[PDB]
Amino acid sequence: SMKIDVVTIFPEYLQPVGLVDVAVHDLRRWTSVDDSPYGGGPGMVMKPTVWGDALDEICTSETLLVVPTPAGYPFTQETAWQWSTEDHLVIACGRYEGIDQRVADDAATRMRVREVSIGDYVLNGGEAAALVIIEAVLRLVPGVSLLEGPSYTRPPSWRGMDVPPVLLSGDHAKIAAWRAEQSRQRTIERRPDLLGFDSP
């Protein structure tokens, strides 16, 4: 059984959401949420004050506080497995140029905190990352290596393109070996790092 709370200034974005409940909270309920960065630089930083009040009410010492950020530890399938057995996830979604670092630092004095990134690209805020994290985690909740090769279904010939004949053969050993070969070839081509080789 898992509870997930998502905190955002754009609750409208989270709309795409009995063993798990997901609740979305408008951060503005606890209040200008942003100001210029100390030290200078472009854009705005979310003030810690409003976040502190929201998280005070929502979190407990048992909470795993998840903070999407481009500067986070990588969120991976291993992370998804790890979080799948948590009782309570709180996902703090930033906007602007991010959240004052003291929010995570203050939270870590009371609960476990995880700053994570879902990939090496830049988003406008944490909401899309929250949707990715929720989806990856929820499909693993109790009671719910190499790249996959290609898949095929009927008809066996389509637009003059045939399903690989081995897949029609009924020979499990040959099919397994072919699928292994397809996966090896794909992994080498697209993700050689997974097999311990240099990236392109």
Ligand X SMILES: N#Cc1c(-c2ccc3ccn(Cc4cccnc4O)c3c2)n[nH]c1N
Summarize as ranges the residues that interact with ligand X (CB under 6 A): 68-70, 72, 94-98, 117-119, 121-126, 129, 148
Using the rule CB under 8 A, is 61 a contact of its own copies? no
With a CB cutoff of 8 Å and minimum separation 6, the contacts of 182 are: 149, 150
Q: Is 170 annotated as a binding residue?
A: no
Does residue 87 touch its own copies according to CB under 8 A?
no
42 binds, among its own copies, ligand X, none (CB under 5 to 8 A by kind): none
Rounded to an integer, what distance in angstroms lies between the CA atom of residue 85 and that of residue 188? 33
- The answer to whether 118 and 133 are in contact (CB under 8 A) is yes
The contacts of residue 120 (CB under 8 Å, 6+ apart) are none
120 is in an annotated binding site: yes
Position 28 contacts its own copies (CB under 8 A): no
Please, which of residues 118-157 interact with its own copies by CB under 8 A? 118-124, 127-129, 131-132, 135-136, 139, 147-156
Contact pattern from residue 155 through residue 184 relative to its own copies, giving x for each residue in contact according to CB under 8 A and a dash for the rest: xx-xx-x-xx-xxx---x--x--xx-----
Q: 123 labelled as ligand-binding?
A: yes
Residue 119 labelled as part of a binding site: yes
Pairing of β 45-46 and β 34-35: antiparallel
Helix segments in 24-164, DSSP class H:
48-58, 77-83, 101-107, 127-138
**Looking at beta carbons only, is 33 or 59 nearer to ligand X?**
33
